[PDB]
């Protein structure tokens, strides 16, 4: 009857306001903060009004109608948001869909540097404004961030400024925390963007399948029934959030978290610490909970899925339940597999039964079906061992460079910053995963990879440069990682013409902190590969190392610029002979 009243009542004012700010910040990334505060308070006041009389004029309008009307009042409409002023001409649900379509994955706003004195001051002087501003900035930059979860991260950014601001050295307490949080923010944005990307490109079925797999791994004690129910609910939550209905999403998420904690005895024995928490902390804990111990009573799958004579019938009767079942069972006995691998396996099963069940004698045909799985498992296992050996041996930086090269050879049309960012992200998978026990590295690796390759793909949607990437991004959610692995030097490349200034470093680099130095040299590394695509990886390691030494020494010098000026051109000219 009054959606706005109903969400204001279930969520409470704090989480209601927060979520409406987040939603606004994502729909209008370019709109200044103060403009959004007033719109939030404005809509929020209306909610209150409606909550006390749901018959009041306009209280029965859809959320969209109310929210889109609010956004379409924001000043400097056409100048600041060109393409979004056209959306305000529309009725809902066209209008909502045009907003949604014009969200910007790489708005490329200033990097968020902590100002610890000036922010503690703003924290103590007005914490609501201060926390609000954090939601705004993160939302702004990650327009598909998982709404309820951002409020959770806003609670940790509060806990942080709370403990460090009263302290002696605010900047020493606060900076490593705010760095850890940014890392968690980025990972979380990447997981949610993979969810939204899967809806957009593959549909709701592909999200269900993914979620059956992962929840079955996580909750192996649970019966198919119960995973199905959680998955149906979880898929609706994320569909909503992804489509921007953040208030609905949060409300539904809290009901799901209630449910799971109502039923943990029949879901998992790890939900116990999670269930003794406030709403946001609990939902978060459930969402990241460790995998439960395997049960002693796991069935043998062979009889039911490869030996049974009734398999084609069972399968023509309800494919999706038969397949969902195989996926649930295979998944829960395999936490040591990646989600994507589990889904390639299911897709091979399904394929084997469609081929075999139309054949002359199907059971002889599907008898060996589990053996089709074996090379699918060997492949990413080998990859992971091979990349972790490399990592263990050369370290993060060089492993990142190995990858910058590998990827620049595959898609040398990608801008340098993208290639650098993706090789760096990929190399950090190295860091996180290679150190885990031997049976956790394949899932760690391939699950985090999926996150990074989706980032790449999302960027490429905005700024398309390469048919090879378009193909790999669209052909199969489960096949992405193998599709990217199989890519080799684009022979279609005409080498990029040499511009000396691109390889030419100056004293400006010596100021930069360590990460920012690497980004520069890694940027030159990408550029080296674009001019000389056939250069071997060892030739580029030596040329890069000679650029490192060169930079280390000239930065170490009494006259930095005369050092760069004298020695730089020699190194630019000679290092082109050392490549191809
Ligand atoms: O690139 C690889 O796959 C591994 C490899 C093997 C031998 C020598 C160098 C590299 N990788 C690599 C590259 Cl391509 C550039 C800079 C530094 C390093 Cl360690
Ligand atoms: C364990 O650590 C890694 C890190 C990066 C990787 C990148 C790739 C890409 C997809 C590639 O094209 O080979 C594969 C495996 C990887 C394992």
The rounded Cα 466 to chain-centroid distance in angstroms is 22
CB 406 within 8 A of CB 448: no
Query: Ligand 1: residues whose CB is within 6 Å?
Result: 390, 394, 398, 401-402, 405, 537-538, 540-541, 544
Residues 431 and 399: their CA atoms lie apart, in Å, by 10
Residues 356 and 386 in one domain: no
The atom number, within ligand 1, closest to the CA of 394 reads 19
243 annotated binding-site participant: yes
Measured over the CA atoms of residue 50, residue 53, residue 54 and residue 60, the dihedral's sign is: negative
Cα 399 to ligand 1 centre (Å):
7
CB 460 within 8 A of CB 473: yes
For residues 555-571, one letter each, b for 16 or more C-beta atoms within 10 angstroms of the residue's C-beta and e for the rest, the string is beeeebeebbeeebeeb
Of 193, 218, 243, which one is at a domain's C-terminal end? 193
Alpha helices per DSSP H over 318-440: 319-332, 339-357, 362-366, 373-394, 396-410, 416-433
* CATH code for the domain of 549: 1.10.246.10
CB 286 within 8 A of CB 274: yes
DSSP 414: S
CB 424 within 8 A of CB 396: no
Residue with tokens 């002087």: 125
Structure-determination technique: X-ray
Domain that holds residue 527: 491-568
Residues 86 and 138 in one domain: no
Residue with tokens 């379509």: 101
CB 263 within 8 A of CB 226: yes
The atom number, within ligand 1, closest to the CA of 536 reads 14
Residues 15 and 94: their CA atoms lie apart, in Å, by 27
Residues 50 and 87: their CA atoms lie apart, in Å, by 27
Is 575 among the domain residues? no
Cα 491 to ligand 2 centre (Å):
22
Residues 316 and 299: their CA atoms lie apart, in Å, by 23
236 annotated binding-site participant: yes
The rounded Cα 118 to chain-centroid distance in angstroms is 31
List of residues 6+ apart from 339 with CB closer than 8 A: 210, 213, 214, 217, 443, 446, 447, 450
CB 46 within 8 A of CB 4: yes
Residues 333 and 386 in one domain: no
Burial label for 350, CB within 10 Å (0-12, 13-18, 19+), is middle
**Ligand 2 lined by 340 (C-beta under 6 Å):** no
How many folded domains does the chain comprise?
A: 6
How many C-beta atoms surround the C-beta of residue 537 within 10 A?
12
Residues 258 and 253: their CA atoms lie apart, in Å, by 9
Is 351 among the domain residues? yes
Is 288 among the domain residues? yes
CA angle (317, 319, 324) in 5-degree steps: 130
Which residue out of 382, 386, 395, 401 has the highest number of ligand 1 atoms within 8 Å of its CB and is therefore the one to mutate?
401
64 annotated binding-site participant: yes
- Specify the DSSP element, H or E, that contains 154: helix 147-164
CA angle (156, 161, 165) in 5-degree steps: 155
Of 193, 227, 262, which one is at a domain's C-terminal end? 193
Residues 361 and 435 in one domain: no
Residues 454 and 391 in one domain: yes
CA distances from residue 257 to 66, 221, 264, 280 in whole angstroms, order as listed: 28, 18, 10, 10
Is 540 among the domain residues? yes
Is 580 among the domain residues? no
Residues 11 and 95 in one domain: yes
Of 104, 137, 154, which one is at a domain's C-terminal end? 104
Give the experimental resolution in Å.
2.3
Beta strands, E only, 106-233: none
In this structure, the residue with its CA closest to atom 17 of ligand 1 is 541
Tokens of 341: 């691998």
Residues 141 and 533: their CA atoms lie apart, in Å, by 34
CB 419 within 8 A of CB 408: yes
Which residue out of 405, 429, 435 has the highest number of ligand 2 atoms within 8 Å of its CB and is therefore the one to mutate?
429
Cα 184 to ligand 1 centre (Å):
29
Residues 512 and 273: their CA atoms lie apart, in Å, by 44
Tokens of 569: 């051109």
Residues 29 and 102: their CA atoms lie apart, in Å, by 10
Q: What are phi and psi of 274, to 5 degrees?
A: -60, -40
**Ligand 2 lined by 423 (C-beta under 6 Å):** no
Residues 156 and 209 in one domain: no
Give the residue from 484, 479, 456, 481 showing the smallest Cα distance to 468.
Answer: 484
Residues 455 and 506 in one domain: no
Give the residue from 276, 273, 230, 272 showing the smallest Cα distance to 255.
Answer: 230
Residues 491 and 412: their CA atoms lie apart, in Å, by 10
Give the residue from 551, 43, 517 showing the smallest Cα distance to 247.
Answer: 43
475 annotated binding-site participant: no
In this structure, the residue with its CA closest to atom 10 of ligand 2 is 485
CB 260 within 8 A of CB 215: no
Instruction: Extract long-range pairs of 310-315: CB within 8 Å, 24+ residues apart.
Output: 311/353, 311/357, 311/362, 311/363, 311/366, 312/353, 312/356, 312/357, 312/362, 315/353, 315/357
Burial label for 1, CB within 10 Å (0-12, 13-18, 19+), is exposed
Measured over the CA atoms of residue 64, residue 70, residue 73 and residue 79, the dihedral's sign is: negative
Give the residue from 150, 314, 159 showing the smallest Cα distance to 241.
Answer: 150
Please provide the DSSP assignment of 507-554 as one string.
Answer: GGGGTS-HHHHHHHHHHHHHHHHHH-TT--HHHHHHHHHHHHHHHHHH
The rounded Cα 338 to chain-centroid distance in angstroms is 16
Q: What are phi and psi of 367, to 5 degrees?
A: -60, -40
Is 577 among the domain residues? no
Residues 512 and 247: their CA atoms lie apart, in Å, by 42
The atom number, within ligand 1, closest to the CA of 399 reads 19
522: number of CA atoms within 13 Å, CB side?
A: 29
Residues 515 and 348: their CA atoms lie apart, in Å, by 43
Residues 386 and 465 in one domain: yes
In this structure, the residue with its CA closest to atom 1 of ligand 1 is 402
Helix axes 467-474, 441-462, angle to 10 degrees: 120
The atom number, within ligand 2, closest to the CA of 410 reads 12
Residues 421 and 486 in one domain: yes
Residues 164 and 211 in one domain: no
Give the residue from 325, 375, 316 showing the smallest Cα distance to 348.
Answer: 375
10 annotated binding-site participant: yes
Is 87 among the domain residues? yes
DSSP 221: T
Residues 480 and 524 in one domain: no
């Amino acid at each position: 009857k009054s959606e706005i009243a109903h969400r204001f009542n279930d969520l409470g004012e704090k989480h209601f306001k927060g979520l409406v700010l987040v939603a606004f910040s994502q729909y209008l990334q370019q709109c200044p903060f103060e403009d959004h505060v007033k719109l939030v308070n404005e809509v929020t006041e209306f909610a209150k009004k409606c909550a006390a009389d749901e018959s009041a004029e306009n209280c029965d309008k859809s959320l969209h109608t109310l929210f889109g009307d609010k956004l379409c009042t924001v000043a400097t409409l056409r100048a600041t948001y060109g393409e979004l002023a056209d959306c305000c001409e529309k009725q809902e649900p066209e209008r909502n869909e045009c907003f949604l379509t014009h969200k910007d994955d790489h708005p490329n706003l200033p990097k968020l540097k902590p100002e610890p004195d000036a922010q503690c001051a703003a924290f103590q002087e007005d914490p609501d404004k201060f926390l609000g501003k954090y939601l705004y900035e993160v939302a702004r930059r990650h327009p598909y961030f998982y709404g309820p979860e951002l409020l959770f991260h806003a609670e940790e950014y509060k806990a942080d400024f709370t403990e460090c601001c009263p302290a002696d050295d605010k900047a020493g307490c606060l900076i490593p925390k705010l760095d850890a949080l940014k890392e968690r923010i980025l990972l979380s944005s990447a997981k949610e963007r993979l969810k939204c990307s899967s809806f957009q490109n593959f549909g709701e079925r592909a999200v269900k399948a993914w979620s059956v797999a992962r929840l079955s791994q996580k909750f192996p004690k649970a019966d198919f029934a119960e995973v199905s129910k959680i998955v149906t609910d979880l898929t609706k939550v994320h569909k909503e959030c992804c489509h921007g209905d953040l208030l609905e999403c949060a409300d539904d998420r809290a009901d799901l978290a209630k449910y799971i904690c109502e039923h943990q005895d029949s879901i998992s024995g790890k939900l116990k610490a999670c269930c003794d928490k406030p709403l946001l902390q609990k939902s978060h804990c459930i969402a990241e909970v460790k995998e439960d111990d395997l049960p002693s009573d796991l069935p043998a799958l062979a009889a039911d899925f490869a030996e049974d004579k009734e398999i084609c019938k069972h399968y023509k009767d309800a494919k999706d339940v038969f397949l969902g079942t195989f996926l649930y069972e295979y998944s829960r006995r395999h936490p040591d597999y990646s989600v994507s691998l589990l889904l390639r396996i299911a897709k091979t099963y399904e394929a084997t039964l469609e081929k075999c069940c139309a054949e002359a004698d199907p059971p002889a045909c599907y008898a060996t079906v589990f053996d089709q799985f074996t090379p699918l498992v060997e492949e990413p296992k080998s990859l992971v061992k091979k990349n972790c050996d490399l990592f263990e041996e050369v370290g993060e930086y060089d492993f990142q460079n190995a990858l910058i090269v590998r990827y620049t050879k595959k898609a040398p049309q990608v801008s340098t910053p993208t290639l650098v960012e993706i090789g760096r992200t990929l190399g950090k998978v190295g860091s996180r995963c290679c150190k885990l026990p031997e049976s956790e590295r394949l899932p760690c690796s391939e699950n985090h990879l999926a996150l990074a390759l989706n980032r790449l793909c999302v960027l490429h949607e905005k700024t398309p440069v390469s048919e090879k990437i378009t193909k790999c991004c669209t052909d199969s959610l489960a096949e992405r990682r193998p599709c990217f692995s199989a890519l080799e030097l684009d022979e279609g490349y005409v080498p990029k013409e040499f511009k000396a200034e691109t390889f030419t470093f100056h004293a400006d680099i010596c100021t930069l902190p360590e990460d920012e130095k690497q980004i520069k040299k890694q940027s030159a590394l990408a550029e080296l590969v674009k001019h000389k695509p056939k250069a071997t990886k060892e030739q580029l390691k030596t040329v890069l190392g000679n650029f490192s030494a060169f930079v280390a020494k000239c930065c170490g010098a009494e006259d930095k610029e005369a050092c760069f000026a004298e020695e730089g051109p020699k190194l630019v000219a000679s290092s082109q002979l050392a490549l191809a």
